């Protein structure tokens, strides 16, 4: 009386790394980190005529 799916929730040993490390994914590739280099090196100076 056990369907195939949901049957992997049983814990056999620490091998669940490859199938259970994503439990709380912290969503997925949604947040933006583009052009966030403003924090490691100094901006190329910008001035006026």
């Amino acid at each position: 009386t056990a369907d195939r799916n949901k049957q992997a929730k049983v814990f056999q040993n620490k091998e669940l790394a490859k199938t259970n490390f994503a439990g709380k994914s912290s969503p997925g590739p949604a947040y933006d980190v583009r052009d966030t280099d403003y924090f490691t090196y100094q901006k190329a100076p910008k001035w006026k005529i």
């Binding site: 814990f11 669940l16 709380k24 912290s26 403003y38 924090f39």
Partner: protein, 434 residues
Amino acid sequence: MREVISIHVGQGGIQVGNACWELFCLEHGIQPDGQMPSDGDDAFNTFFSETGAGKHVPRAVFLDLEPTVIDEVRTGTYRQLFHPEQLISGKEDAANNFARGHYTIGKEIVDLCLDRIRKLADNCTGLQGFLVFNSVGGGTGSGLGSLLLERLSVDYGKKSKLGFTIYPSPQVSTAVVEPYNSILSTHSLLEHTDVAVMLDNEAIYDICRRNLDIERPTYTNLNRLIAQVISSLTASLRFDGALNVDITEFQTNLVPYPRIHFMLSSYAPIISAEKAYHEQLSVAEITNSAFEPANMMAKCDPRHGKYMACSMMYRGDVVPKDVNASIATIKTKRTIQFVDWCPTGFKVGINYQPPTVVPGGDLAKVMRAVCMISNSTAIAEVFSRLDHKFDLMYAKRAFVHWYVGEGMEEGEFSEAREDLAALEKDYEEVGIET
């Protein structure tokens, strides 16, 4: 098969966090160079990461908008330990202007912090919660976390959390504008954090002077004592135990209602190697010292009200027998009275691992220890004083103008006072017997 993520925003979290990680690092025997020395498994997984061989990456992400503190560690002894690129730093200081940290400069920072958190969470298998330590009595410290809490809560769902904040002392102060920043953070944090402990600093000032016999302690000494408490509370999740207590089994037995989730904790025993050897330190006397009025890590008098529910943790080689005797001893007591609606307010926990003494520090090594986390009605005293501090200066709108200059609506302060007053009304109500 567990894990947790550590976060700190601002100097106050970093310094203790810098102070704390020696405790965790020293316990498991990982040498400061990060590489295991010389040559019992899965115990280190509780706080560390395995890349295959050698060193480990602490589950921490240090944040701050002022680079002074971060640079110090980044060139110090522990430099090689933390991940090279997880120490995100800002460029302009907050300068205790809370409005600055939440809408003008803080916006550009949370982008990374969310990212850095996300990556670390991914490698965790059974994420149980978070440890967020931030100084409410600071401009950047409160603001950065407050934004961090707001995103995170809407980020993950129903996850449990713990916050070991640091409120400002009632009469002795650090800054002059802190009374404001204390209230605003409360509202943004009241409806987002499940549990947060009360650890106002002065209490440790008196505690150190009363037992440890020190007439001139610096901030570091305070940093160690807080570190142990975290160790005592979270020690169960990684080692063997006769009756384990987990983080997710914490606010199932400490928060009577979804509203009132602010409790204070005290630590004991604390005794040096310079005086301890004259007492057997039997468990009969140890526990009673825990409830003594002057040892509350929160600058408030518990005797001013009834208790809601107390969860007290031991550690060492304590046999379960004594717990029954001590608990029976507490109930018969005459000075401490329990609220009418809570029949029994004790959740007994025991772990075998004894606290590890840090050579050259204050704490010595003893074969007993009990740490408590209790939510009691007395905490209303701290809240009432904060409002009285707050209300006055608003009377002539002193210093209010600057908060206006950062884009904060004038009424933004108006909503704050009601919540405390609204909460202030809440506290007494639960105190009325049926």
